[PDB]
Design a protein around this ligand. Structure first.
Ligand code: 9ON
Ligand code: 9ON
Lengths: 291, 291
């Protein structure tokens, strides 16, 4: 299998290296020379343009920053692709954008999946990413051997756009939980309840969630959590702010009522203006900006 | 060891609690000013008395299960002088941290040992003797109390000094309320995006957003057939009771000057929903997010 990998950034570069490492022929394009060089150093044949990268490919993977860039990449490359090429978009983009590019691809006789990922650079490098997939089950079956060497988990979420929708809905919940957990630890401290004691209660009770059992925003109860390491990501505020922007687009596009998610979105947008580089659990320290 | 216990408050939690004490071979002296509650308790072996002070006069331990801080205060005022010195008072009511510490001090000024030990698990937990007790006060007092708590309890956790039981409970329940709303928002958003309830369930429960509000209390019928959504939102944990705890959380916020943006937002949402739907499981808040 020959794979064209379009976007060789902080996620794309290690993903593509795992593909090389699993026996695929990987062709590549990135507009940053430092990204393209890094990738050629691990065996990707890099080309000057995306249409050239796509020319001989059975599978085309995108890992790009916005729906607008993904769309312009599709219209740039679709005529260069061979028929029945399989397109996998692993970018995190809106549901609307996902569905538009899916339809554009299939109109050219291609097969297309949305497959955005969770796990970050660390997951990408360790080949433990979780892919949330939208599209036809038979297209996913065909893609499975390409995805497997990048992935710890591959979940079929439904028809085109479902992958994007599942990730966005999970991350909106996550954001709300990280804030609620933070509020809880600060309230407890002002009530004279120790952090270990609250941790022991909540983790054994109905309030338990990853935001506390793994991402505990106070130092001590979970020695590996970002709070014990100057809030080094982990999952940056910048990235969480990005996901919540997409959740707010989805909310606006559907007319949905999402009071806590929208509140969380405003909290993180404001926090990202100052602390975009910190793990999102660092929000515990911005609560008095609220009043 | 077998002990004489006065049980003040024989309502839908106190009655089954008192029944389990009788089953464990304790002599239980009960009082409740609602004769119907008292009659039900007598049927399961509680010796019912004409007045609270009479019930406490010959008791080694006095348990209160009462609706509010004010009723606890009034009860302690009415009975502390009647109890034998160094009687152990356990308050398993859910009341404000401020109120807890006030009644704790009151009990101690009368020569009585006192713990706060509010419970979670509701009436079914009460009947099954699987309640979680979250305890505030001295280690040695809790050591004294353990034989009495065990026949009612699935978990006993020592949370810290007087008031810490109440604090731990109210922090966990605030988090729960926020999570239950956030889960509802996600499921509605999914429905509007065309993502199925089952698919969203599968994702969130396998990802970082997983929590009891989805995995046990799923607010759409289907994915968790035992959840209240499948039974006309019969509680479960009523909106009335969540609204009361949320009130207690807002009291704790106001007493400390803490900042709890989502917890306060969740309190406002539940206070509105409680005006007409006090009787429904708190998962039913999902109704407010749909047209
Ligand atoms: C466990 C994983 C297989 C992919 C792999 O080999 O990394 C999956 O089933 O998604
Ligand atoms: C919860 C208590 C045991 C009492 C029970 O099984 O009812 C304990 O294990 O501390």
């Amino acid at each position: 299998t020959t794979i064209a990998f379009l976007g060789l950034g902080n996620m794309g570069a290690p993903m593509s290296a795992n593909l090389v490492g699993a026996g695929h022929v990987v062709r590549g394009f990135d507009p940053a020379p430092t990204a393209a060089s890094g990738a050629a150093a691990h065996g990707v044949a890099v080309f000057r343009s995306a249409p050239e990268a796509v020319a001989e490919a059975d599978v085309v993977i995108t890992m790009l920053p916005t729906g607008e860039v993904v769309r312009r990449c599709y219209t740039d490359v679709l005529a260069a692709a061979r028929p029945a090429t399989l397109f996998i978009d692993s970018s995190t983009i809106s549901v609307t954008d996902a569905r538009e590019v899916h339809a554009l691809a299939e109109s050219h006789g291609m097969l297309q999946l949305d497959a955005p990922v969770s796990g970050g650079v660390k997951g990408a490098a360790a080949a433990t990413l979780a892919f949330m997939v939208g599209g036809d089950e038979s297209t996913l079956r065909r893609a499975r051997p390409v995805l497997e060497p990048m992935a710890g988990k591959i979940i079929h979420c439904g028809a085109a756009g479902a992958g994007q929708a599942a990730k966005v809905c999970n991350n909106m919940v996550l954001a709300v939980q990280q804030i609620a957990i933070a509020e809880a630890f600060v309230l407890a401290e002002k009530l004279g309840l120790s952090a270990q004691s609250l941790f022991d209660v909540i983790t054994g009770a109905t309030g338990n969630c990853w935001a506390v059992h793994t991402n505990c925003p106070v130092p001590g109860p979970v020695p590996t959590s970002p709070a014990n390491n100057d809030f080094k990501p982990g999952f940056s505020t910048a990235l969480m702010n990005k996901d919540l922007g997409l959740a707010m687009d989805a909310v606006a596009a559907t007319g949905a009522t999402a009071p806590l998610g929208s509140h969380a979105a405003d909290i993180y947008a404001k926090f990202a203006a100052d602390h975009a580089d910190l793990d999102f659990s660092a929000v515990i320290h911005t609560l008095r900006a609220r009043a």
